Amino acid sequence: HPRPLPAGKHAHRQSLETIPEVAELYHCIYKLYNEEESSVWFREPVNALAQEIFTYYDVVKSPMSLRHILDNIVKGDTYSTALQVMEDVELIWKNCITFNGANSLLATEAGKCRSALDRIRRAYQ
């Protein structure tokens, strides 16, 4: 018996029998949608984010956030050392690369955060 079909990416049509100026533009828009890192935000309808949030919990084995680390420090039942804390902070960055890819704007943001923490920690001295 047939299960309902999952959502996915647009299947590209090598050839189309519409107007040439529209067909050309289609091929161009497909490349943008498929290859350009900056298109990530605009590829799919916004309601497909639910689906992506679901895929995140399938892809990333150990999810992590700054909130989760801060709340765990306060609770006092998780972290005995600063190195333990930093392994979770590194994990945020590793998860981000894992899910978003190294070329993504989010990978760049993760890198900025890493060094912004280094700055703040060194300035705390």
Place this chain on the structure above:
Amino acid sequence: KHAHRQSLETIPEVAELYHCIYKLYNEEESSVWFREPVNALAQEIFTYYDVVKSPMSLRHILDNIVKGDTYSTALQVMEDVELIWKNCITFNGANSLLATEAGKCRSALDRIRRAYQDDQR
């Protein structure tokens, strides 16, 4: 958002680091993506459909071209592509990183379109 504890009675190296992580979480623009758990971000989806009158995506434009019952001209197609950028500014503001990304996309399309036509000639 996490309520900051001015003083904590954990180890000094952990406590110092906590204060540092809080500043990152609270003040650093680049931390926005990593502040809260990913499942908290589903909330924004519903607000988007309240704010943006005519939502639009690249998927919607691509599927509509293929179907052949929407777009008669290239200018029609581009009005929907422009709409994606107008919606982005509307929802995120002009100064946002996402507004910059929308701008990069506009030009990335210009690049690809010109590389398509110059490739032919």
